């Protein structure tokens, strides 16, 4: 049933937009975290080098 096969395609296409927005949120969280840790590491090493 073609009308039924397209129905699922659209059902999946919509569900896909959801998962994507979600994956990007979980991604934004982690990046802000890693950047924080990385900002520290950059500062630790920054001090050390200055005192060598």
């Amino acid at each position: 049933r073609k009308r039924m096969r397209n129905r699922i395609a659209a059902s999946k296409s919509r569900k896909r937009k959801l998962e994507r927005i979600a994956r990007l949120e979980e991604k934004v969280k982690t990046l802000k975290a890693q950047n924080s840790e990385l900002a520290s590491t950059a500062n630790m090493l920054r001090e050390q080098v200055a005192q060598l």
Binding site: K17, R20, I21, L24, E25, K27, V28, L31, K32, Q34, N35, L38, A39, T41, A42, L45, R46, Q48, V49, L52
Partner: protein, 53 residues
Amino acid sequence: RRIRRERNKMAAAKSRNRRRELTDTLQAETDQLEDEKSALQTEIANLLKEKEK
């Protein structure tokens, strides 16, 4: 009615553009965080080169 319809067109256009701009915004954010991430990382590898003297 031709009018009640061109209006539902808008309401659906609006509803669609809104949800699209959202992903376009979450996507813009991650892409700038990934930029800051590589800049930190490159920075770290530079400081580490200096630490080795």
